[PDB]
């Protein structure tokens, strides 16, 4: 094949042009996103039961939903969260790889069969299914800087004149609103209701009757009488469209003209649907929008379009409004693209410089510069054809594979140049001989790299996708590079080389070149005689090999393991949990204190604090609170003392003094879609039907037991809310009936006075909005106030609510959790800074084994993924080992020679482990990928050396020692050149300061250690293995 | 409160979450 294309340079040029065109077309159209679909598909069902405690929502709503959601295939695990506010959330997480667009239909259809089995209020509110594993492209906050608009006004303005336009641009998927639009609130007044002899049911009936739409029909009906010529539409009563119209609703009119109006008994205003969440941006009331990227869309273009559309609206922005972007993900993608371009340019310049330094010929230097971009475009085209995207992992694989492309180019060019120098033949025949000698080795190493990288893509779960991106990119790059080396490069060696005379290797000239050649030749002679001397003996270095092996094993065992390193994303969360029974006022005070601290003592680091009151990751309620703190750009935060870790450590140290609140601060995981906390999630599940008190006592005992080992477990905290006092009202049914009061009236009054009822819909400024009915604050705020409400009996008299009702106190849980259909509770927390996660998991399992009988344990979230390393058992590494053994035995006919090649594998793993231990990084996915790359490079060097030695031994009559020494003398310049190129090209990865530098640091350190140690300890060791294998198996 | 509390007693108002029975504490009056 290579000699075939040598005589036809333009055939190779045509193939290159086709590949370049394919790469350009691929780069023209390709989705761009921060991360691929890494998290497993998840569907969340949300339902609302206004003014209902946790128990009512749990038994009457989510029980029926959970019962009727059985039979869904590919279901991994289900969780359920009820609340005292009245919201229930059921999250179903499926297996990885399934089509979510069908699972959503399945769960929705199964839910629609249980709709008539739910109470009426939840049906009127409505339930909604959605996909929670989508991640937020950006959040757009809108704030008021004068004090006119409130949260409700801002939310309605966004819902009316911002949501549609922002949703109707290009590339935008789901758009979520963090507020609620307007709603006509009707605040009763018990004094006025008693004055006119009315009850809330009368107001509800009047609103239902006087705020309806009637199908009037049509003038000149559908069957017309003979001789009709007029036809029109009749417009009868319609929905009320203003507060002044709602205030004129009649409630009681006598025959003499006396009337009672709704405004005479209640206050009508325009408010929100629920006053449960208060959002303040830097101390000002604010609302927000969440924009998610649609599938198969460009992130940067969508962001630019969103920014332009938002900047269009300022002339029409009313009053004082400001638009801010607390959190967006585009800078990471821009940084990734910039790093890719920088690495490509640096590699090209570096390889040109090193080729000029060594080969001294410009025509030799120019050959790879017109070959590496061809392979890059081919990789782009193949990756586009397969169905991948431009993530932050594929480009990392490309910057990793640049070294492989450079290695192939260096090998081919150096071999042809040395053949020409030592043979005297001109470029044509020298290229023919070199290609004929090296084609088998090239095919063998391509097959070896494919065999070592493909099985990594067969992992399951999130790790499966993370490995899949790198594996696909690497194998595509290797295949394209070897195809290019077979087709395009031999033509280049045929045409663009100068046939210089033998012996003119720069020794005829002085300066840097001749002198450098002098020490290079002297060092080559020294190395050759040294390796000959060491090869004279065999058993002296077997003990060194065993020492290296045992040291590598000890380092592998000692090195801690984790899942994925933390990164400085510029955003971190702060959580506030007040004691049980705390109201909104104290939470607002604590949030104000936190905001003041952040904006006063960290002015040079933070940029804005988006405080949210009433909602927390643990559980919604008037007891918790959250705050998303965003930092300035990484350019303005120099040093390691101004990163996320130091900032959050100082923040929690300072917040430890905040009384009446346990304020914590933490950093969100690098992949935001998978989980919300950086630590493991552990779940205790009741099985023997103990109840709730036993479960709580067991959880407290386990927490105390785990807190007694402050060496591997840190920040072990519950994820729920503790039990709270509750008010119990008991109505004397027979007393109420005796007095003449119907039970229905009492129940309706109690449910519409303190809980609030949703009655009808109305048209406001050209849109549909609900109307809500509830008492006016001061009459529903203390227990004694329950005596202020009056109910009409049959006789027409009004009886007070305190004449037939009592009251008492109780204890109840404000948040009930369920896992897989059983009551359960969750403990979430990280591990020690100096130990592996798996050891903490094992110790937590051992601690849970000591629990009282009847309580089981389980994992969820990333922990479950960490428990999916059963495929990471040697059952897969061994498969790869046998596959590469078979490939090596097939490349050259021997069942024993590949042992020498495999013996070089530990010599790079030892260096990778040394670098990891020196830097202190843990064993994670990126380090594993770098280790595999180093193993592949060492195997490539071993393949080249062994193949050259075997060819010299077989084709000619050279003896074992003589052929081995000649081969190792011959394969010295390419190895050193490739090692120098790789080591110098991976400098920025190790030296990277910030901007998502954790993965870069880990991979660069692993690559540096592996490459340096393999280059140092392979030239001296591979010949020993070769000669030992040949003599022992002679 | 009708019974249980006497004149001159001290009742904690803040720091309840971070405190536990039978622990020495620094008590300060708040306004």
């Amino acid at each position: 094949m290579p000699n075939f294309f040598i005589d036809r340079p333009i055939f190779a040029w045509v193939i290159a042009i086709i590949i370049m065109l394919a790469g350009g077309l691929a780069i023209l159209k390709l989705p761009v996103a921060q991360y691929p679909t890494i998290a497993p598909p998840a569907v969340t069902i949300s339902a609302s039961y206004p003014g209902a405690d946790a128990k009512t929502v749990q038994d009457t709503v989510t029980q029926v939903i959970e019962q009727n959601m059985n039979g869904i295939d590919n279901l991994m695990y289900m969780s359920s969260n009820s609340d005292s506010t009245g919201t229930v959330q059921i999250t179903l997480t499926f297996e990885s790889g399934t089509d979510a667009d069908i699972a959503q239909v399945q769960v929705q259809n199964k839910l629609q069969l249980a709709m008539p089995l739910l109470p009426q209020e939840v049906q009127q509110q409505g339930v909604s299914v959605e996909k929670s594993s989508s991640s937020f492209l950006m959040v757009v906050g809108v704030i008021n800087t004068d004090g006119t608009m409130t949260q409700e006004d801002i939310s309605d303005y966004v819902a009316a004149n911002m949501k549609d336009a922002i949703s109707r641009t290009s590339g935008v998927g789901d758009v979520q609103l963090f507020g609620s639009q307007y709603a006509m609130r009707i605040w009763m007044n018990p004094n006025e209701l008693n004055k006119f002899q009315l009850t809330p049911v009368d107001v509800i009936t009047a609103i239902k009757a006087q705020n309806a739409q009637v199908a009037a029909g049509q003038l000149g009906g559908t069957p017309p009488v003979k001789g009709q010529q007029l036809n029109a539409s009749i417009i009868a009563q319609t929905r009320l469209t203003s507060t002044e119209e709602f205030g004129k609703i009649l409630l009681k009119v006598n025959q003499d003209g006396s009337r009672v109006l709704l405004r005479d008994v209640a206050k009508i205003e325009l408010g929100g649907e629920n006053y449960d969440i208060i959002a303040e941006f830097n101390g000002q009331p604010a609302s927000g929008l969440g924009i998610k990227l649609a599938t198969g869309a460009n992130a940067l273009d969508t962001a630019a379009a969103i920014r332009a559309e938002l900047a269009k609206m300022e002339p029409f922005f009313p009053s004082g409004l400001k638009i801010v972007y607390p959190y967006d993900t585009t800078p990471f993608v821009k940084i990734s693209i910039h790093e890719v371009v920088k690495t490509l340019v640096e590699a090209i310049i570096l390889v040109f410089l090193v080729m000029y330094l060594f080969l001294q010929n410009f025509r030799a230097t120019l050959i790879p510069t017109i070959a590496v971009p061809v392979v890059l475009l081919g990789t782009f085209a193949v990756l586009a054809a397969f169905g991948f995207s431009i993530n932050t992992l594929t480009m990392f694989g490309m910057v990793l594979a640049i070294g492989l492309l450079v290695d192939d180019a260096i090998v081919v060019v150096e071999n042809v140049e040395r053949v020409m120098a030592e043979e005297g033949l001109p470029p044509k025949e020298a290229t023919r001989k070199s290609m004929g000698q090296i084609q088998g080795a090239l095919v063998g190493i391509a097959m070896v790299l494919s065999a070592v990288f493909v099985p990594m893509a067969f992992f399951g779960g999130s790790t499966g996708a993370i490995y899949r991106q790198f594996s696909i990119t690497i194998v595509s790059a290797m295949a394209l590079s070897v195809l290019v080396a077979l087709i395009l490069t031999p033509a280049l060696c045929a045409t663009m080389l100068k046939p210089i005379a033998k012996g003119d290797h720069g020794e005829g000239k002085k300066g840097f070149f001749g002198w450098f050649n002098r020490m290079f030749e002297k060092s080559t002679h020294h190395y050759t005689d040294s390796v000959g001397g060491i090869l004279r003996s065999t058993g002296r270095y077997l003990v060194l090999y065993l020492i290296i092996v045992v040291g590598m094993a000890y380092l592998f065992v000692r090195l801690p393991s984790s899942f994925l390193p933390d990164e400085d994303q510029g955003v971190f969360m702060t959580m506030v949990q007040l004691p049980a029974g705390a109201t909104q006022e104290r939470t607002q005070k604590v949030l104000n204190e936190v905001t003041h601290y952040y904006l006063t003592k960290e002015k040079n680091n933070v940029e804005s604090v988006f405080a949210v009151n009433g909602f927390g990751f643990a559980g919604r309620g008037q007891n918790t609170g959250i705050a998303f703190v965003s930092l300035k750009d990484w350019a303005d935060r120099p040093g390691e003392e101004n990163k996320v870790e130091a900032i959050t450590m100082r923040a929690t140290r300072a917040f430890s003094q905040i009384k009446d609140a346990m304020v914590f601060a933490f950093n969100l995981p690098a992949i935001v879609e998978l989980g919300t906390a950086t630590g493991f999630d552990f779940e205790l599940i009741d099985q023997a039907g103990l109840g709730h008190e036993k479960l709580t006592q067991a959880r407290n005992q386990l927490l105390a037991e785990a807190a007694k080992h402050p060496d591997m477990l840190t920040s072990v905290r519950p994820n729920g809310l503790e039990d709270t006092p509750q008010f119990k009202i008991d109505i004397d049914q027979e007393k109420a009936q005796a007095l003449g009061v119907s039970i229905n009236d009492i129940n309706t009054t109690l449910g519409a006075a303190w809980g609030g009822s949703y009655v009808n819909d109305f048209i406001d400024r050209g849109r549909v909005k609900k109307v809500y009915v509830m008492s006016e604050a001061k009459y529903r705020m203390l227990p004694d106030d329950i005596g202020d409400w009056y109910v009409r009996a049959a006789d027409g008299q009004m009886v007070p609510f305190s004449a037939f009702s009592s009251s008492r106190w109780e204890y109840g849980s404000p948040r009930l959790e369920r896992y897989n259909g059983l009551p359960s509770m969750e403990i979430l927390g990280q591990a020690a800074p100096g130990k592996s996660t798996g050891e903490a998991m094992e110790l937590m399992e051992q601690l849970a084994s000591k629990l009282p009988t009847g309580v089981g344990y389980d994992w969820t979230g990333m922990s479950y993924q960490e428990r999916l390393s059963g495929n990471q058992a040697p059952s897969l590494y061994a498969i790869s080992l046998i596959v590469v053994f078979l490939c090596l035995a097939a490349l050259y006919e021997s069942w024993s020679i590949p042992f020498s090649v495999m013996l070089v594998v530990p010599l790079g793993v030892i260096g990778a482990l040394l670098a990891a231990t020196f830097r202190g990084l843990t064993n994670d996915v990126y380090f594993q990928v770098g280790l595999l790359t180093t193993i592949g490079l060492s195997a490539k060097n071993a393949i080249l050396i062994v193949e050259f030695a075997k060819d010299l031994m077989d084709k000619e009559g050279k003896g074992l020692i003589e052929a081995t020494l000649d081969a190792v003398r011959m394969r010295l310049r390419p190895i050193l050149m490739t090692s120098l190129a790789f080591i110098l090209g991976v400098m920025p990865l190790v030296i990277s300061t910030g901007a998502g530098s954790g993965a870069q640091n880990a991979v660069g350190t692993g690559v540096m250690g592996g490459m340096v140690t393999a280059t140092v300890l392979a030239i001296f060791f591979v010949p020993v293995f070769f000669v030992v294998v040949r003599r022992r198996f002679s | 409160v009708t019974e249980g509390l006497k004149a001159g007693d001290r009742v904690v108002i803040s720091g309840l979450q971070k405190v536990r029975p039978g622990v020495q504490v620094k008590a300060q009056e708040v306004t």
Binding site: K659 | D9, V11, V12, I13, K18, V19, Q28
Partner: peptide, 15 residues
Amino acid sequence: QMPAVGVVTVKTEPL
């Protein structure tokens, strides 16, 4: 370290 608490003083008064 030593935990600190904010405490109130109980004194009778007519209402």
